[PDB]
From a paper:
In eukaryotes, stop codon recognition is initiated by the binding of the essential termination factor eRF1 in complex with a guanosine triphosphate (GTP)-bound eRF3 to the ribosome. Our structure shows that the MoMLV RT interacts with the C-terminal domain of eRF1 via its RNase H domain.
We solved the crystal structure of MoMLV RT (aa 24–671) in complex with the full-length mouse eRF1 at a resolution of 4.0 Å (for simplicity designated as MoMLV RT/eRF1). MoMLV RT contains an N-terminal polymerase domain and C-terminal RNase H domain connected by a flexible linker, which is not visible in the electron density map and is assumed to be disordered. Structural comparison of the RT polymerase domain in our structure with that in a MoMLV RT/DNA complex and a Xenotropic murine leukemia virus-related virus (XMRV) RT/RNA/DNA ternary complex, reveals that the binding of eRF1 did not cause a significant conformational change in MoMLV RT's polymerase domain. The catalytic residues (D524, E562, D583 and D653) of RNase H are distant from the bound eRF1. Structural superposition of MoMLV and HIV RTs based on the polymerase domain showed that MoMLV RNase H swings 92° to a completely different position, accompanied by a moderate movement of thumb and connection subdomains. This movement is conferred by a 32 amino acid linker region between the connection and RNase H domains of MoMLV RT, whereas this loop region is not found in HIV RT and is relatively short in other genera of retroviruses. Intriguingly, we observe an interface between the RT polymerase domain and eRF1 within the crystal lattice in our MoMLV RT/eRF1 structure, but only between symmetry-related molecules. Structural superposition of MoMLV RT/eRF1 and eRF1/eRF3 complexes showed that eRF1 interacts with both MoMLV RT and eRF3 through overlapping surface regions, suggesting that MoMLV RT and eRF3 are mutually exclusive for binding to eRF1.
Residue numbers in the entry:
A (entry chain B): 5 to 349, 371 to 420
B (entry chain A): 24 to 102, 106 to 329, 332 to 448, 455 to 489, 499 to 599, 611 to 663
Amino acid sequence: PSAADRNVEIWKIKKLIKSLEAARGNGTSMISLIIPPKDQISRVAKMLADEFGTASNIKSRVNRLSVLGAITSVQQRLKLYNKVPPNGLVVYCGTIVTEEGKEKKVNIDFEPFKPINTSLYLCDNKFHTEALTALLSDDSKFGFIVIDGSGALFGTLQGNTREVLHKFTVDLPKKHGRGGQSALRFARLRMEKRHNYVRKVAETAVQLFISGDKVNVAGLVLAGSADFKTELSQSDMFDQRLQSKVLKLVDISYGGENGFNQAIELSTEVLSNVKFIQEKKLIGRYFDEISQDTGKYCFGVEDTLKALEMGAVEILIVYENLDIMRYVLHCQGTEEEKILYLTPESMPLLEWFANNYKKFGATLEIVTDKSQEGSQFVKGFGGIGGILRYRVDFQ
Amino acid sequence: TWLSDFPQAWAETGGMGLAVRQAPLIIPLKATSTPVSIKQYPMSQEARLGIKPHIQRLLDQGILVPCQSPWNTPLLPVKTNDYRPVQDLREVNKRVEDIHPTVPNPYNLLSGLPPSHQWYTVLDLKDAFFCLRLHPTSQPLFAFEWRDPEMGISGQLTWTRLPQGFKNSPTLFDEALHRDLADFRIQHPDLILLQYVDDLLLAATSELDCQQGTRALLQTLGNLGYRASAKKAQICQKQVKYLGYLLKEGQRWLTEARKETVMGQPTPKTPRQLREFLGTAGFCRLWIPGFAEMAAPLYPLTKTLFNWGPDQQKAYQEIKQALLTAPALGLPDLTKPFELFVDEKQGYAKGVLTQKLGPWRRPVAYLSKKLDPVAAGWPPCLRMVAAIAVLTKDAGKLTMGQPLVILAPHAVEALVKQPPARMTHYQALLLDTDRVQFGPVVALNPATLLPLPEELAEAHGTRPDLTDQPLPDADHTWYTDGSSLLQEGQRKAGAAVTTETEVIWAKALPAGTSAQRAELIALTQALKMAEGKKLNVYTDSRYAFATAHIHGEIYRIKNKDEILALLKALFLPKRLSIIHCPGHQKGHSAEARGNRMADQAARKAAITE
């Protein structure tokens, strides 16, 4: 699990939901077969040939041909896969109108990430992509810290149903007891025990959320009453691993378990907007790389592909809507090369990266123009470039 | 029964009219005006004989009379062969002293109507203007010659009453009628009465209130000596036509005839017909969504080069489209709370004043206005505030200081607080929150300008409209390079800003500088000499591009000098596009021929100082 490598897979789901909805055939010509993990393969082989006899009786020539050729298509395809892999098998077969007229068999078959009970089979004039988009409801584990003079709470908000973890309090003196010491002798004891309390907060957060390798929590939100809602942000008493994962710092009163529930209610929008906040941080660090003149960046097409094949590039940052295509042909004089066009005189390049980023490099992140730093990245640098490991020449 | 009950009030039974309470009218002239005697048009016998019975009937009614004036004007026949007379009084109307048309436009006259009264009664007065007398001092003015070429009768006539064609007549009539009916307004409250020149509308609560009011009103008109049209009247109806506006049950459309006058004039091509195509549509601007932004391409042809392009042929057609799709508007009711949605784009405000009908919103108007130049220069959320402000000022005319819930695509209530000049004027009538209020952020229909089910901060901003886009106008193609490494001794230090054929600008630098500061200094300089000539600048060095294209970033780096010059130097040419094309500079298409030429300028023409 890499929360970055997963976000490209979820992008490739979003682009398959765009293209399958776009394409449409003619009469009952579109099979939307989804197999779970647990169900057997010859059971499905038996259930298809069942419907082949129910599609022998149809009696409507052209669509009767379309169903028989498509059920004949999936049975050949399903035979080359021995039983079911640990996630399942999602499938889409049917004939549809493409560009310039013509006919086009699409033929899709693959393994996603866990549709356990998803067992759907539907033949129709259009595909059925309701189960795939059901995979994109996954609100991740979101962390919470609330601090007050009396005590502190640690917990989790995973979507809507709420959770709580460690209830801990630390004593610090209230008001000003002006007994047998002096005016200022208590002021020193206030920072002492506050900074003590903050360190204990820092260590307790370091223990429960991280677990070990990879941080358990996908994103954190902070909240408090006094300097606790300033002190922790500015000073990196809080940094240790999880500081980068912080979404937004919230202002609250109360400071008990009802502070928890003000925070979750003021941070419902921000937890659902992971991609947008994480985008603006990733573009944020890209622009900081140019600001410091630290030469760990690149941009434009020919400079990017250089950073890719060299394997300097750590993190690739590409706009989802790249008009560019890549191209590979036999040419004149029987040879093989790569051009990458912009304007007219194969597939998209964003699609190519999505598949092969792991090969040389090798990290990918998809970005949008809605973000005001993302907007800058797009119309300024043409929507392509990335984070590198060291100083690069080019020219 | 209505005709028998009011014998004097109706034109068909009551005879000719005569406003008995109105004294004859003297007509003030300009100091520099004198009597003008025009040759009468030599007329056809077929026409002249066709006119005579109309003139004969006026003489018998005492309206026309013989005279011997030093003024004269012509007599134009008109129109089947049934020739009726027209005078043409242009040469008089030039010489006459103007009066101020105190008359407010038909719509905003109707804006003085409530939907509490849904029982109507419309009249119009036949040969209205003739009921006002003309003081003998003024009579000679309107003289015209007449003849009979089969009788020798070549002599002068003139008017005892107010003629038809004199410029001030509608206004002069309006005042007079207003005065005559102020008596009726005082002794009949509860009813609403609307007049504009020769048209009347009597609004009532029940059918009973209308019938009694109508009777009262008619009885008065006969007493005063005005004559109403028995044919074209509309007595005690729920639905009525008035001033080209169809009313019914608290709603207000345009009558198809009022549309037709705008729809039934050809593509003008002259500055008069164009100005008066906008003039005529002006009364209908309250039904057109976003009239200001629709009518943009035509206002430059007010006053001129008359290039009627596709953008204006489109704009002229969007208006007819909008007129054909003109909806019901509600009368302002003044008890309910009102709701003004607003949007702005391309320097043009546009929005809709609505209010509650059941659980729905039925629009009352479509208010739009262009943002004035100083405001049109401001950033997006600013220009959204201005628009709200402008439409709110105008809305006030219709709301009469009643509850008002503003909406917009950018929630900008927080902005009212912090503007880092002009805001005293706005904040006055925005944050005076006795009448005014904001409401939820929301998207609008490009078409209807009504809200959509759809849910930002106003805490942002930094950079211009810079792109990586060889702009479509294609102005100066300028290639920038520099050189501060060592060759055959010490560090060279030289810049250049060329084109594909010419040299344009070049120099040397100080002995110091850096390695790649050269490229900045050359680009800064390349961006100084440009202002209203668009420019696209090609950069050989890639450090130059990025730092220069980011944007514009404030900070809380150890080379601020050149940088802070570059950062500020970029606001200078209108619409800029910094591109970077070392792809490839080694080389040669119809593009990198000039990149090559900038690289050969900054090396050779560099060793001088």
